[PDB]
Design a binder for this molecule. Structure first.
Ligand SMILES: CCn1c(=O)[nH]c(=O)c2c1nc(Cc1cn3c(n1)CCCC3)n2Cc1ccccc1
Ligand SMILES: [Fe+3]
Length: 292
């Protein structure tokens, strides 16, 4: 039979809290693992997300001086790399976020402001999320153009700690491309395909998502460019991905979905999409083979 899936945007209230691994439950190797103040701070963010309901304004947070310094460090270094690494759509939208959502090295943008910007541009919106959801639940948000977004900041001891998303990753990696209509349609269609899909199908869609939205490369005017959010918020891997040291294959959902998604290391392979439109077309053909 078909599993429950959300039928309208407010139904994400019933699956956005189905958190498998809560935001304050740190990994043993997390830089903040022995930091009680940071643990308390993470519980604060997790509770904001748990208490959030669709329709609410996303709670605005006063970030600490330390958190803002962490963001600034990350922001300054990445912005040196974006002109020579990021895809044209990313570079087109990033200055709009500086102008309208307060992206600055001494200011962390609020999720509510970014959500309002996205709603106007592509109809995307943000939902704060306490922690990790099943791939079924996470992808289901995209069906309604909702992106489940972490609100906390990485621990200050390691401004380059990358295996878990934080709000730096969300704001610098994901948001500029959600502001692009062709990328928003691509993303939404991943979510639509997942709704009520088999567990097998959901997993394959999640892997395709990983190797496009999170670690995708594209070809523009004959050059390799980056559009994956995980690359766009990782200083070292952003550089690695466009070096001669990286293994690169064409995006092809039936092949790409066999690839293991790595967590604590650079990816072993990156997949190059021809355009967001072509990636979208390829996903359309693939989803017909795994769902109906
Ligand atoms: C489809 C896979 N997938 C899933 O199944 N469930 C998710 O909840 C999920 C996800 N993917 C991402 C987003 C995400 C996860 N990551 C990154 N972005 C940047 C690189 C580090 C891992 N999230 C959001 C998330 C939020 C807090 C902790 C882990 C993951
Ligand atoms: Fe991400």
């Amino acid at each position: 039979s078909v599993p429950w899936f959300p039928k309208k945007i407010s139904d994400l209230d019933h699956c956005a809290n189905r958190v498998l691994m809560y935001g304050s439950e740190l990994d043993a190797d997390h830089p903040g693992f022995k930091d009680n103040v940071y643990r308390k701070r993470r519980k604060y963010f997790a509770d904001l997300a748990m208490n959030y309901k669709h329709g609410d304004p996303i709670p605005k947070v006063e970030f600490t001086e330390e958190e803002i310094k962490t963001w600034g460090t990350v922001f300054q270094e990445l912005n040196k790399l974006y002109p020579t690494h990021a895809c044209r759509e990313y570079l087109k939208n990033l200055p709009l976020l500086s102008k309208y959502c307060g992206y600055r090295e001494d200011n962390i943008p609020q999720l509510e402001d970014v959500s309002n910007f996205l709603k106007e541009r592509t109809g995307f919106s943000i939902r704060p999320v306490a922690g990790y959801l099943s791939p079924r639940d996470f992808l289901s948000g995209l069906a309604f153009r909702v992106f489940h977004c972490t609100q906390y900041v990485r621990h200050s001891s390691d401004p380059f700690y990358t295996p878990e998303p934080d709000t730096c990753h969300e704001l610098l990696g994901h948001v500029p491309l959600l502001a692009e209509p062709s990328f928003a349609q691509f993303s939404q269609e991943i979510g639509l395909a997942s709704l009520g899909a088999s567990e097998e199908a959901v997993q394959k869609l999640a892997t395709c998502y990983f190797f496009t939205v999170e670690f995708g490369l594209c070809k523009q005017d004959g050059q390799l460019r980056v559009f994956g959010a995980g690359l766009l918020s990782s200083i070292s891997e952003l550089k690695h991905a466009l070096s001669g040291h990286a293994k690169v294959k064409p995006f092809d959902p039936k092949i790409t979905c066999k690839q293991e998604c790595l967590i604590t290391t650079f990816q072993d392979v990156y997949f190059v999409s021809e355009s967001f439109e072509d990636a979208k077309e390829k996903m359309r053909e693939f989803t017909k083979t795994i769902k109906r």
